[PDB]
Amino acid sequence: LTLPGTAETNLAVPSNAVRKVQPYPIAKPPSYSSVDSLRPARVSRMDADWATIYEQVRRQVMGNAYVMEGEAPDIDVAFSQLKGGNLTVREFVRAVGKSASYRTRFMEAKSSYNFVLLNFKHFLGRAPTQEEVSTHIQILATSGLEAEIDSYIDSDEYKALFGDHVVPYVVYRGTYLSSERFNRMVKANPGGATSDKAKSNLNMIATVAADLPTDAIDVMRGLPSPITSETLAFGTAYYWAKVEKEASEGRSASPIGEKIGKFDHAPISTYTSLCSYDKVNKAPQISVTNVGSDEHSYVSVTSKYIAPDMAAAAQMLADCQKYKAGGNAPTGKWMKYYPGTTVNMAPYISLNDTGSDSSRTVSVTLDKVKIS
Amino acid sequence: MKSVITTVVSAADAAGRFPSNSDLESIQGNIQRSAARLEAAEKLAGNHEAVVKEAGDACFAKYAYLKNPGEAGENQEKINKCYRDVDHYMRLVNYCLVVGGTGPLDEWGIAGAREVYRTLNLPTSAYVASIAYTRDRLCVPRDMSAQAGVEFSAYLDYLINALS
Amino acid sequence: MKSVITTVVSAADAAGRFPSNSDLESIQGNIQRSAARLEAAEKLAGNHEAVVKEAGDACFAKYAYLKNPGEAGENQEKINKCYRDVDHYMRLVNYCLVVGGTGPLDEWGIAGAREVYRTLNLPTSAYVASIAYTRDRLCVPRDMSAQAGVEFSAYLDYLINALS
Amino acid sequence: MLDAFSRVVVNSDAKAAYVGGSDLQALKSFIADGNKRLDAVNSIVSNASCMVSDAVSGMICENPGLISPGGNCYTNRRMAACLRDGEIILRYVSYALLAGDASVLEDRCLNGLKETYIALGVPTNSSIRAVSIMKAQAVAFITNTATERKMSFAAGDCTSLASEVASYFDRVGAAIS
Amino acid sequence: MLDAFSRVVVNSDAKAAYVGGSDLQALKSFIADGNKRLDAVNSIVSNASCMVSDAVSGMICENPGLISPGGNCYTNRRMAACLRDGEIILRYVSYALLAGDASVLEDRCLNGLKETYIALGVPTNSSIRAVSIMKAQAVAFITNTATERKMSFAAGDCTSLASEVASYFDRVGAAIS
Amino acid sequence: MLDAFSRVVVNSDAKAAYVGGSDLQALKSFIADGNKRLDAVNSIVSNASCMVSDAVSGMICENPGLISPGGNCYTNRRMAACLRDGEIILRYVSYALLAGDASVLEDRCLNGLKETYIALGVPTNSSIRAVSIMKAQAVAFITNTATERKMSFAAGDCTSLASEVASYFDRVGAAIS
Amino acid sequence: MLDAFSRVVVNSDAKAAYVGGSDLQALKSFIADGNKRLDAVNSIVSNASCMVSDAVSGMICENPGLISPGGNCYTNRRMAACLRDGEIILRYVSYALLAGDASVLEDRCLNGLKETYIALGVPTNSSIRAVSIMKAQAVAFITNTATERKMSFAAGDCTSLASEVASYFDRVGAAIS
Numbered sequence A: 001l002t003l004p005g006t007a008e009t010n011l012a013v014p015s016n017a018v019r020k021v022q023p024y025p026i027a028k029p030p031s032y033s034s035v036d037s038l039r040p041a042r043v044s045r046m047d048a049d050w051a052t053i054y055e056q057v058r059r060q061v062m063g064n065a066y067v068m069e070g071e072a073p074d075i076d077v078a079f080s081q082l083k084g085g086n087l088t089v090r091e092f093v094r095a096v097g098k099s100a101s102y103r104t105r106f107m108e109a110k111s112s113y114n115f116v117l118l119n120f121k122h123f124l125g126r127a128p129t130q131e132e133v134s135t136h137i138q139i140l141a142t143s144g145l146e147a148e149i150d151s152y153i154d155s156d157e158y159k160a161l162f163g164d165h166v167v168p169y170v171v172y173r174g175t176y177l178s179s180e181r182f183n184r185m186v187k188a189n190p191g192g193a194t195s196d197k198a199k200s201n202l203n204m205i206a207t208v209a210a211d212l213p214t215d216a217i218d219v220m221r222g223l224p225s226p227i228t229s230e231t232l233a234f235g236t237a238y239y240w241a242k243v244e245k246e247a248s249e250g251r252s253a254s255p256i257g258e259k260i261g262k263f264d265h266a267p268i269s270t271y272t273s274l275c276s277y278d279k280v281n282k283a284p285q286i287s288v289t290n291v292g293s294d295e296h297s298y299v300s301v302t303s304k305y306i307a308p309d310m311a312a313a314a315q316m317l318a319d320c321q322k323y324k325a326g327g328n329a330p331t332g333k334w335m336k337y338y339p340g341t342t343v344n345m346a347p348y349i350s351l352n353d354t355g356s357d358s359s360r361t362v363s364v365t366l367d368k369v370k371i372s
Numbered sequence B, C: 001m002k003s004v005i006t007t008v009v010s011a012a013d014a015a016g017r018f019p020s021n022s023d024l025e026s027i028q029g030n031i032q033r034s035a036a037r038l039e040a041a042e043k044l045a046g047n048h049e050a051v052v053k054e055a056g057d058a059c060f061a062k063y064a065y066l067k068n069p070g071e072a073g074e075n076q077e078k079i080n081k082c083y084r085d086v087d088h089y090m091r092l093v094n095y096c097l098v099v100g101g102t103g104p105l106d107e108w109g110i111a112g113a114r115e116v117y118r119t120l121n122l123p124t125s126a127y128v129a130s131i132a133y134t135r136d137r138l139c140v141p142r143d144m145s146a147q148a149g150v151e152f153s154a155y156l157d158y159l160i161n162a163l164s
Numbered sequence D, E, F, G: 001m002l003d004a005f006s007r008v009v010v011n012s013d014a015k016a017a018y019v020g021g022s023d024l025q026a027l028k029s030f031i032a033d034g035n036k037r038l039d040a041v042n043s044i045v046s047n048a049s050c051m052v053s054d055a056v057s058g059m060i061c062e063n064p065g066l067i068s069p070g071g072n073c074y075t076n077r078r079m080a081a082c083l084r085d086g087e088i089i090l091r092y093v094s095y096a097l098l099a100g101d102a103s104v105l106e107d108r109c110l111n112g113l114k115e116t117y118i119a120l121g122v123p124t125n126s127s128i129r130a131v132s133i134m135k136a137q138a139v140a141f142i143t144n145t146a147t148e149r150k151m152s153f154a155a156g157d158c159t160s161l162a163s164e165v166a167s168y169f170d171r172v173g174a175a176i177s
């Protein structure tokens, strides 16, 4: 809408008011990168026509959206200026991302954490680290949608990889800033016939990019690698590991079990009296409200709640370092294998009949809200 | 789907903020508007079989060509498919009077109409003739209230404008 | 700025479509609410010099330490700066009672408050002592109508929640 | 996503049924507490900053094991995360109080919250205690039984919305348990 | 309606069990002292995450050899399992306070738990002290004589419910020993 | 990626063998039906829009569970997708018929089609029926046995290409089963 | 049952046992005036946490040398251990009140107390002064003559159990004389 020549909008850096448009598209990154020779060639503004620039912007920025002809007129607004040269293809995907057709299939329907991971998949063509999420999740908290898409397009990572004339694509650069950052990029970017719309939870890179260890599974990276770079290893060897993953990646089998949350349970023969291993760690999940006369204080049975292995790292590791000075004055040798133990009567309250008392011995130590 | 609530809740979430006093102000209009459109819904639901019967054949009265062989209406059962094809449209404008926005009409009846009616050779001019026959047949003293006839007609021509 | 009109006319533009029946219905709420808040603006504009004199000093009655030397209140004139520095907020509550949303409150009073009040050493707790002193003194028989005092309190606590 | 108006159409879309006068009065009953719902959300976001800061510090003051070093809420960054982490829960429950049903926060906020807090290492038993303070104060405001802050209202019953927001806050707690 | 509660707690084919508005006073007329008994469980399950984190740390600060090398609460695979196991006893005893019967507590929770703990090597000297803290923690919340938290209630006597959970915690102390 | 001339070079790259006169005449026979393959691809893309529209409506007319609500081809957007979903299957088998081997569709169309249709909820037995109509029609065109449309050709044998495209249409069926 | 209560005490390990209501009426018939005696234990141990926290605080206000540096209640390791010996007198006189004998008081507690207090440097003239306050505290609780906490009771006379506990408290003091 603005001008027939516009390199940069919104005046974020000071040196874009004097910056020209790029007269030619930018070069490839200068490292070796053995994978990209098997890859198809990148599509730019000045080598290809508008039939395939629109398809690859749908194949990368829109994921695989299946935009119809009456669907997305906001993209048809933004595409009609790109064919007139009124904005570059760098600014065009800023107009695609800020549009509501990008919002109404990636922002409202996916989760809050998954919206950041799809933005690195579409705009930068990779998958972020945890520190890249934690700087991008505050823009969704304090500044909203429009400033968060400005963090990709006005970044220096975009302008060095694509510049003003190159459609976004999966850039294999060989020497990466982290060894995770290759194979988390590859896992985030599968090949054809995959979209983002069915996986309303993505749930697998949402927990590999969540904690900084637990790099993702090898068959989830041998799957979208290119060809004469996967073969003689995907006939039937890892192929059943690929199919068993695809029924788990599809329908979003939540990886509490095998990926993170890793608890050595006891064998089933060890208890056998608290039996029926379907119902082994189930508790009543009770909730009361007690407000007026509409309550629904509904008790549920809860699921097999696991020891969380970090609240047991707050407890028992950080605090409870109170086992200090434990010589406890070993005087009076006849004490019959017990410490100071009160008989501890504890009368269960005499509601006049059918209520009775039992007793139990226990070692007693005075608490810390006690004497002086 | 695209209601007046989902308009203001997603816009308050895309800004990343609480529901402000503009957004509480937008829902206050719905008390003044649901008293008129919800009785237009039950006037549609209580008369839905008549408005498909004596108005679905008005497309065939205008377009008497398409019952010829080799064309879009071949036998008796595709005409029975055609009265099924327009019953979903009268279901959807009943489905948008109850919402308050145009939400259930777009992705369920509109989005993708340029694809399926081009491949299966279904003429959209015969669709909109049957819908606009229902549009000009509204009146105040017989059908509904004088206010509900505005908004019931205001959903039907949006189906005309999106199909044409 | 961020009104109830400019929320629903930008969300219609970012979708790239016409104003539908969900967008036309949101302006019908303004018929039912502008009788309540525009009376509150005339009660604020007719009493703006009173509500900064006997309510701007109540922060100094709570914080008498600010008038110590070496602090944000040094001489007579910074206190005369301060009553201007609170009157711009009460102009902005008046500037959003007539809009209907929180439009002119955000980019004119809120957006950038964490920068200038931290660098120049101004305590924001002594801002909200003066603002919430005006908040709890609303009542139905003397001040305004019963509905205007709900909305006038509903813009004050948004300024409390933004600064705190 | 799905409000209270569009909840009864997707139940009726699976039946291919027109919405008629057997359940429109159930939806017309929802509009009858329109202003009762409308003041209730306004009383939530009135004191929303004082809501979450009393909730997280109350969770600290009963369980001071996170302030100890090695704890999850130890450093100054993670407390700024945790004050933000309970603020999103208040922001999305207030959407469900405005939409009338737990459908906006279910697929955006709760969808994948369980393994996010497990993988980062959030103590999930303390997150139950975090939002249970936010449950008991949300019913304290919309029944106006809050002692230190009393807001003026038109008199009447509002306990039907009090069971609404208390059915949302344990849906968050069940999604993180 | 308690058979709906008892079938979902023995893990039959329902997912959860909700009680309505008219059924809630029907439940309150069924059991005796229905207003106080729902207030007693609401005191317990609001502080369940604080109680088992204090009782496990109360068990460690009596016998500090559990977090010594060779102990049972060393290797925090085990320490998160012991923090799980305190919650499962508290969640089953809060149902038995709600139902008024210990019959769910004996057949779902306690048969074979003496056989399970000798097969796992769980020491019965410290496991009784884990329960005996949680008897004293639950009985202080019911009569509102907790030191830190004083929760608001309709005033009266609740010591008939306070001696009820001391009978229910003694059945945990009987079936573990 | 891999065409028919480049298929034998990776069979010879694994042996480090110069490709010579023991299998060049097997590849010279491929050029002998060079025009027979070339007319065969043109007949598929001649009536390509009438190919898929008859095929997906034939899958509808034998199974009206999809037009029923709750079915996966009920609404208008999903019929627009299912017209286009089977069109991409025609678009890639026409690539592999031109390239002479199933390598161009096995990584651009089949690599990832199974988990997309599982997570969407696409009935896999219906898409088996949908592409097997396209198997029976693609061999009806290149054997010139289409009843409603006969095209002129040089007369001769073409059933070696009939099993070629029929081998491709069971490759798309195996990857979705 | 009392032999089963003997199995609670003498086993040199933590153990617990209760008595059901069918078994309870056999215990009230076996002992004499047992509704007083079950009220006698329940008067003491419900106020036992204040009884030892006032008696050993009353020992300090009569002898301030124990909070001198080097004195035996100076550090909090020793101060918590003085209350730990304070409560363990009070439980073992309560079960001796409950069983009605003194043989469990001599054999489990007092056999070896003189041999372990001289070996630990415990002031025996000061701990006799501590237990004589607990003799004077318990006779106020058994006759409902406490000035702060007065408890509800089925009325009558229980001065025979007032003389029974004073025959138990001096048996402690004669054991450490």
Ligand SMILES: C=CC1=C(C)[C@@H](Cc2[nH]c(/C=C3N=C(/C=C4\NC(=O)[C@H](C)[C@H]4CC)C(C)=C\3CCC(=O)O)c(CCC(=O)O)c2C)NC1=O
Pocket: A001, A077, A078, A079, A080, A081, A082, A083, A084, A085, A086
């Ligand atoms: C956001 C605001 C906005 C607009 C107002 C329009 C404005 C607009 N129109 C065109 C582009 C055009 N606009 C016209 C229109 C006309 N020429 C005529 O002879 C008629 C008088 C008139 C129609 C009534 C034509 C014919 C082109 C294409 C020019 C060409 O390539 O032949 C372009 C360049 C993009 C493209 O070529 O597709 C833009 C930005 N588009 C927008 O995005």
Ligand SMILES: C=CC1=C(C)[C@@H](Cc2[nH]c(/C=C3N=C(/C=C4\NC(=O)[C@H](C)[C@H]4CC)C(C)=C\3CCC(=O)O)c(CCC(=O)O)c2C)NC1=O
Pocket: A111, A112, A113, A133, A134, A137, D056, D066, D072, D073, D078, D079, D081, D082, D083, D084, D085, D086, D088, D089, D108, D109, D113, D116, D120, D122, D123, D126, D127, D130
């Ligand atoms: C889109 C929706 C949305 C949410 C539902 C929340 C959920 C959420 N929380 C955190 C992240 C976190 N959340 C907490 C919060 C807590 N830990 C505790 O011990 C307390 C119980 C609790 C505060 C009440 C902490 C401490 C971190 C940071 C962990 C760390 O790096 O140390 C993250 C990762 C991003 C980040 O680290 O900043 C996400 C997505 N945030 C969102 O953006």
Ligand SMILES: C=CC1=C(C)[C@@H](Cc2[nH]c(/C=C3N=C(/C=C4\NC(=O)[C@H](C)[C@H]4CC)C(C)=C\3CCC(=O)O)c(CCC(=O)O)c2C)NC1=O
Pocket: A288, A289, A290, A291, A292, A295, A296, A297, E024, E033, E034, E035, E036, E038, E039, E040, E042, E142, E143, E144, E153, E154, E155, E156, E157, E158, E161
């Ligand atoms: C929907 C869920 C639901 C609940 C949570 C309870 C909540 C509840 N409790 C009571 C009412 C009461 N609750 C108590 C209980 C106590 N008072 C004390 O001082 C003790 C600390 C504590 C014992 C546990 C008492 C004593 C009454 C008064 C009635 C009575 O004496 O039995 C009442 C009736 C009067 C009132 O509103 O206060 C209600 C609704 N009932 C419900 O329907």
Ligand SMILES: C=CC1=C(C)[C@@H](Cc2[nH]c(/C=C3N=C(/C=C4\NC(=O)[C@H](C)[C@H]4CC)C(C)=C\3CCC(=O)O)c(CCC(=O)O)c2C)NC1=O
Pocket: A327, A328, A329, A330, A331, A332, A335, A338, A339, A340, A341, G056, G066, G072, G073, G077, G078, G079, G081, G082, G083, G084, G085, G086, G088, G089, G108, G109, G113, G116, G120, G122, G123, G126, G127, G130
């Ligand atoms: C079976 C019954 C039974 C008992 C009777 C006690 C007896 C007892 N007391 C102490 C141990 C102690 N007992 C006291 C008590 C006192 N010193 C004073 O100045 C006061 C007069 C008096 C408290 C009122 C102190 C201060 C210690 C610790 C001594 C030390 O740490 O050096 C110990 C050594 C073990 C340890 O505490 O680690 C034992 C066995 N414990 C039992 O298990």
Ligand SMILES: C=CC1=C(C)[C@@H](Cc2[nH]c(/C=C3N=C(/C=C4\NC(=O)[C@H](C)[C@H]4CC)C(C)=C\3CCC(=O)O)c(CCC(=O)O)c2C)NC1=O
Pocket: A322, A365, A366, A367, A368, A369, D062, D063, E047, E050, E051, E054, E055, E057, E058, E061, E062, E132, E133, E136, E137, E140, E141, E145, E146, E147, E148, E149
């Ligand atoms: C050296 C190790 C050591 C500890 C870790 C603590 C552990 C501990 N806590 C309590 C005792 C208790 N613990 C709680 C529980 C709570 N109180 C609250 O205010 C919170 C809401 C909630 C979680 C903290 C309650 C209510 C009591 C009883 C009254 C009280 O002491 O507050 C008791 C007394 C139990 C009894 O007498 O049988 C003990 C031993 N004390 C110790 O000596």
Ligand SMILES: C=CC1=C(C)[C@@H](Cc2[nH]c(/C=C3N=C(/C=C4\NC(=O)[C@H](C)[C@H]4CC)C(C)=C\3CCC(=O)O)c(CCC(=O)O)c2C)NC1=O
Pocket: B043, B044, B047, B050, B051, B054, B136, B137, B138, B139, B140, B141, B142, B143
């Ligand atoms: C909810 C939509 C809805 C409708 C529009 C009508 C549609 C409708 N109109 C008529 C029947 C009629 N409709 C009209 C039209 C009108 N009559 C007047 O008094 C007005 C001036 C004018 C309103 C436009 C007339 C004059 C007839 C009788 C003559 C005829 O059949 O055309 C009939 C046949 C007989 C009948 O059922 O009444 C039907 C199905 N019904 C519906 O359920």
Ligand SMILES: C=CC1=C(C)[C@@H](Cc2[nH]c(/C=C3N=C(/C=C4\NC(=O)[C@H](C)[C@H]4CC)C(C)=C\3CCC(=O)O)c(CCC(=O)O)c2C)NC1=O
Pocket: C043, C044, C047, C048, C050, C051, C054, C136, C137, C138, C139, C140, C141, C142, C143
């Ligand atoms: C635009 C908003 C606006 C206001 C709220 C008032 C604020 C206000 N109130 C008072 C003055 C007062 N305000 C009240 C308070 C009340 N009086 C009642 O009848 C109610 C019960 C209760 C409403 C909360 C009382 C009792 C006085 C007189 C005593 C005093 O000066 O405090 C004064 C000083 C003298 C005066 O001018 O009256 C001012 C500036 N003025 C304004 O311009």
Ligand SMILES: C=CC1=C(C)[C@@H](Cc2[nH]c(/C=C3N=C(/C=C4\NC(=O)[C@H](C)[C@H]4CC)C(C)=C\3CCC(=O)O)c(CCC(=O)O)c2C)NC1=O
Pocket: B021, B024, B025, B028, C033, C147, C151, D032, D033, D034, D035, D036, D037, D038, D039, D040, D042, D141, D142, D143, D144, D153, D154, D155, D156, D157, D158, D161
């Ligand atoms: C733009 C800002 C704005 C709002 C936020 C709403 C608030 C609002 N509420 C009510 C009116 C009311 N509001 C309530 C609600 C409550 N009363 C209580 O005691 C409870 C605390 C609370 C329920 C949670 C009740 C009970 C009425 C009166 C009955 C009713 O009209 O619903 C009315 C008057 C309706 C009438 O009487 O005709 C208005 C205008 N309206 C606005 O213009």
Ligand SMILES: C=CC1=C(C)[C@@H](Cc2[nH]c(/C=C3N=C(/C=C4\NC(=O)[C@H](C)[C@H]4CC)C(C)=C\3CCC(=O)O)c(CCC(=O)O)c2C)NC1=O
Pocket: D047, D050, D051, D054, D055, D057, D058, D059, D061, D062, D132, D133, D136, D137, D140, D141, D145, D146, D147, D148, D149, E046, E148, E149, E151
């Ligand atoms: C150990 C430290 C400690 C704290 C920090 C507080 C934290 C705290 N507050 C409340 C409980 C509450 N907290 C509030 C919140 C507020 N009240 C207001 O007037 C303001 C608007 C807002 C705080 C700024 C309300 C309204 C209640 C209900 C009781 C009440 O009305 O006071 C509860 C009980 C929650 C529940 O019942 O489930 C807790 C733990 N309490 C503590 O024991």
Ligand SMILES: C=CC1=C(C)[C@@H](Cc2[nH]c(/C=C3N=C(/C=C4\NC(=O)[C@H](C)[C@H]4CC)C(C)=C\3CCC(=O)O)c(CCC(=O)O)c2C)NC1=O
Pocket: A264, A265, A266, A271, A274, A279, A280, A281, A282, E056, E066, E072, E073, E077, E078, E079, E081, E082, E083, E085, E086, E088, E089, E108, E109, E113, E116, E120, E122, E123, E126, E127, E130
């Ligand atoms: C039906 C009710 C029900 C329970 C009561 C628990 C009982 C229980 N605990 C454990 C399993 C365990 N339980 C403990 C617990 C403890 N060890 C100690 O030192 C403390 C005394 C105590 C915690 C307070 C430990 C440490 C393990 C793990 C054993 C090991 O890994 O060596 C297991 C084995 C299965 C598994 O953990 O995967 C079971 C069934 N679970 C249930 O489903």
Ligand SMILES: C=CC1=C(C)[C@@H](Cc2[nH]c(/C=C3N=C(/C=C4\NC(=O)[C@H](C)[C@H]4CC)C(C)=C\3CCC(=O)O)c(CCC(=O)O)c2C)NC1=O
Pocket: F032, F033, F034, F035, F036, F037, F038, F039, F040, F042, F141, F142, F143, F144, F153, F154, F155, F156, F157, F158, F161
């Ligand atoms: C750009 C457009 C273009 C094409 C599409 C091809 C088509 C083409 N086909 C043939 C020639 C032929 N084509 C066929 C093929 C068939 N006959 C049948 O009956 C079957 C239906 C069908 C196979 C599927 C046969 C059998 C011959 C004769 C033998 C042969 O030359 O291969 C020839 C002449 C070769 C010759 O005879 O010397 C040409 C030019 N060439 C083109 O230039």
Ligand SMILES: C=CC1=C(C)[C@@H](Cc2[nH]c(/C=C3N=C(/C=C4\NC(=O)[C@H](C)[C@H]4CC)C(C)=C\3CCC(=O)O)c(CCC(=O)O)c2C)NC1=O
Pocket: G068, G069, G070, G071, G072, G123
């Ligand atoms: C200048 C010369 C000189 C002295 C006179 C003593 C004075 C003296 N005695 C004790 C300290 C003490 N004195 C006693 C002695 C007694 N307590 C009793 O109950 C008995 C009845 C009585 C002795 C017959 C005891 C038990 C201690 C504490 C033991 C200790 O401090 O290690 C202390 C405290 C030391 C400390 O704080 O650790 C001092 C200064 N020391 C000196 O350097």
Ligand SMILES: C=CC1=C(C)[C@@H](Cc2[nH]c(/C=C3N=C(/C=C4\NC(=O)[C@H](C)[C@H]4CC)C(C)=C\3CCC(=O)O)c(CCC(=O)O)c2C)NC1=O
Pocket: G047, G050, G051, G053, G054, G055, G057, G058, G060, G061, G062, G132, G133, G134, G136, G137, G140, G141, G145, G146, G147, G148, G149
């Ligand atoms: C120097 C400091 C100093 C003290 C710490 C107290 C210590 C103290 N308390 C009591 C005496 C008592 N102490 C209690 C104990 C209690 N009362 C209750 O109601 C609570 C439940 C519980 C803890 C507060 C009781 C019940 C009595 C008897 C009161 C009486 O004599 O009438 C006695 C008299 C008994 C005796 O001399 O043997 C003394 C000295 N007095 C002091 O001069």
Ligand SMILES: C=CC1=C(C)[C@@H](Cc2[nH]c(/C=C3N=C(/C=C4\NC(=O)[C@H](C)[C@H]4CC)C(C)=C\3CCC(=O)O)c(CCC(=O)O)c2C)NC1=O
Pocket: A347, A348, A349, A350, A351, A352, A353, A355, A356, A357, G033, G034, G035, G036, G037, G038, G039, G040, G042, G142, G143, G144, G153, G154, G155, G156, G157, G158, G161
């Ligand atoms: C299940 C556990 C259990 C208990 C906690 C007690 C509780 C208890 N005590 C008594 C009953 C009594 N309790 C006492 C004792 C006393 N009365 C006083 O006023 C003195 C202060 C105190 C002396 C120590 C007396 C004198 C009676 C009545 C006579 C008797 O039954 O012994 C009764 C019978 C009351 C009745 O039926 O009317 C009951 C249930 N008994 C139990 O079975």
